[PDB]
Amino acid sequence: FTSDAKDKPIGCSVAISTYSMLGHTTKRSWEAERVMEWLKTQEWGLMILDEVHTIPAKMFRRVLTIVQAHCKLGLTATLVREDDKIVDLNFLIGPKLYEANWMELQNNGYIAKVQCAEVWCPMSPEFYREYVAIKTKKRILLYTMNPNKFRACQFLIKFHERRNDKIIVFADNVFALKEYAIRLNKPYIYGPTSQGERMQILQNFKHNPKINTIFISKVGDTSFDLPEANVLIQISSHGGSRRQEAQRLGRVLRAKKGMVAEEYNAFFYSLVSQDTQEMAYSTKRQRFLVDQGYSFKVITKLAGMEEEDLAFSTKEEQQQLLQKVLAATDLDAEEEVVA
């Protein structure tokens, strides 16, 4: 029951629905006359909230008033809600019933130990020209397309592929993620990617062991049916909410079967350009991670980052990349839409 799709009140037994449909101010459609009057009439024996930690007071108050369910159960990712603000709406549901300790999940392998790391890549002199000169947000590509960041990304991906670790690569920009995945010759998914073209990749990643690394647009910041992976790398450490980043990180990362004895059986990477606006979000992520108890480290260089064949090894290819970045418009350099 959601205006994005056809719905079936007749003989329903479990209505699964979207708050923004139900907490409307005024009817969305005749389909709201169909369902909302019907839903206002039903008395559900139990209400399950999957994202109560994200719903605003007004939408929750409207929903609770409309349904009047006999029991309500609030499911949350984190106790502190981004919409908690002055009033903790949790009391509308009731006390906290239980809290699974991060240590109990890690000690029992339910949630893998995630290696949080940041590749603090030194800024390239040429990119530094453009970084300080470009005060506008077109600067985003400069920290994102630094050869140091690309070469480190390429190595670690090929490393995690050698380990046959399922890995997903995420970025804040269309051109950046495209140029990476294209030059790396790896799958990339975007909004225009048709479901069959998308499923071809997903099935060959979720089940076929050949595809170890896939590239996913900023859409991964939200529900885009992201697959399961053991390693995640942020091409940009620039990003939004720390909790939403942490939510995404846990959503995708899964314990690598049989590797729990290793230092880590899950890995997270976020790539950082030194002396750039990325370092604050990097620092705040670093802090928020250690605050949340996650293990963290910083990376600058590791074996193979220069001992292996990696792109842009010559000044000209670096120049072509930088000129292609400079020739790209602000739109191609701006933050990729999330949808």
Partner: protein, 452 residues
């Protein structure tokens, strides 16, 4: 800021004595205890060879002695050799036919021998047959007194109230360059070196502080050799036993008064002729406090992976030190809570404090519960503490003289050859024919540029 930040050059016994005159060292080696102090400070390499050679007056050939150590370790043996010779301990003598025989300085030999076995003096020590002293002082009372005195000096650097010290000592703190004279009347101020010293450990602190006293000693007319020998005898003294000021020069009396005021020695009265040496004096040697909480007194800082510091300390001094590099969060009666952060550590860095000082300062004070593990400080903290300085210690300044834009490559290669000839070359660019030379060559090469 033409050069890098001012660093507190920690000169151990080798660096200090290595600059002294042989006659001074010979006079110093006059006492048996001075020889033992020097000897014990030597590396095990020298320590064994000296002991092995002590009973000979024959100039053993340099090669045979060098052939006492295995091929791979002979290279490391050169370090001890260079030290022993540089420290006048080893003097070459020639075997028949001019072969390089080796001999230890007879004074040093004879004093070590008099140290091990009877000699004309009984270690220059005696009881004077006196009984138990009036107003007996206990070992813990001596330690606390010495501690209190040392704390008062550190408190004086911190500029806290009740830090009672003589102006000559306050002057020395400023004269040594620890307390910066940024304002008239010498109000509490500290240089980078003084902060580094504050974070340094007690034995290295006391050692270098006394080295500055010695550096000013002859400027103050005090007897270097005598004070040093007295200090070494004190380092080899016993806490509970009593020692006498009988037969001490006024120079030693002045130093003894400082030494008493400094809390290294306890006296019944300033004028009394019998005293008890404190733990600090016995422990006054160029050594290391350790890689974790101190053997003599355990650490109290519970450093945690989340950069949170739980220092079980009451001491306003220690607390104030933690405030220099860490951001403090709470004060609790038995424990203090703080966290290390970029800003607060960048405060230490900008004040001129190497991250290793903080790492070691925390290590030496690491609470004993943090022990029983190889790394006492988690790697993430150690790495990020260092990374914070490595973030902002990339710019390295160096004063020099630039030679550029010569008329041809011959000029560059000639000037570079001249820079190579004099070893005054700092850096050069052969593509643009650019050369940087030490400032000493400024006039010499500028004038030569008119001649070439």
């Amino acid at each position: 800021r033409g050069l890098n930040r001012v660093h507190l050059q920690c000169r151990n016994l080798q660096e200090f004595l290595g600059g002294l005159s042989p006659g001074v060292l010979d006079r110093l080696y006059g006492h048996p205890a001075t020889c033992l102090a020097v000897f014990r400070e030597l590396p095990s390499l020298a320590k064994n060879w000296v002991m092995r050679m002590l009973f000979l007056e024959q100039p053993l050939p340099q090669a045979a002695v060098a052939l006492w150590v295995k091929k791979e370790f002979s290279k490391a043996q050169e370090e001890s050799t260079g030290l022993l010779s540089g420290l006048r301990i080893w003097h070459t003598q020639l075997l028949p036919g001019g072969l390089q025989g080796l001999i230890l300085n007879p004074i040093f030999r004879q004093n070590l021998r008099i140290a091990l076995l009877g000699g004309g003096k009984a270690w220059s020590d005696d009881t004077s047959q006196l009984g138990p002293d009036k107003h007996a002082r206990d070992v813990p009372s001596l330690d606390k007194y010495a501690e209190e005195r040392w704390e008062v000096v550190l408190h004086f650097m911190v500029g806290s109230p009740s830090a009672a010290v003589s102006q000559d000592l306050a002057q020395l703190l400023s004269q040594a360059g620890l307390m910066k004279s940024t304002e008239p009347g010498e109000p509490p101020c500290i240089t980078s070196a003084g902060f580094q010293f504050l974070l340094l450990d007690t034995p290295a602190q006391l050692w270098y502080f006394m080295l500055q006293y010695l550096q000013t000693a002859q400027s103050r007319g005090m007897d270097l050799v005598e004070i040093l020998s007295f200090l070494f005898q004190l380092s080899f003294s016993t806490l509970g036993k009593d020692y006498s000021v009988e037969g001490m020069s006024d120079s030693l009396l002045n130093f003894l008064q400082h030494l008493r005021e400094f809390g290294l020695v306890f006296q019944r009265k300033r004028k009394s002729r019998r005293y008890y040496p404190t733990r600090l004096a016995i422990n006054l040697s160029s050594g290391v406090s350790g890689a974790g909480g101190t053997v003599h007194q355990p650490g109290f800082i519970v450093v945690e992976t989340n950069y949170r510091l739980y220092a079980y300390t009451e001491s306003e001094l220690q607390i104030a030190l933690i405030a220099l590099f860490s951001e403090m969060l709470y004060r609790f009666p038995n424990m203090v809570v703080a966290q290390v952060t970029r800003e607060s550590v960048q405060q230490a860095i900008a004040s001129g404090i190497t991250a290793q000082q903080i790492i070691h300062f925390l290590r030496t004070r690491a609470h004993p519960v943090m022990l029983k593990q190889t790394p006492v400080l988690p790697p993430t903290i150690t790495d990020q503490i260092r990374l914070w300085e490595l973030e902002r210690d990339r710019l390295r300044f160096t004063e020099g003289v630039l030679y550029n834009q010569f008329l041809s490559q011959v000029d560059f290669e000639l000037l570079l050859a001249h820079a190579r000839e004099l070893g005054v070359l700092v850096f050069e660019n052969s593509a643009k024919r650019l050369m940087v030379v030490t400032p000493a060559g400024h006039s010499d090469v500028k004038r030569f540029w008119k001649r070439q």
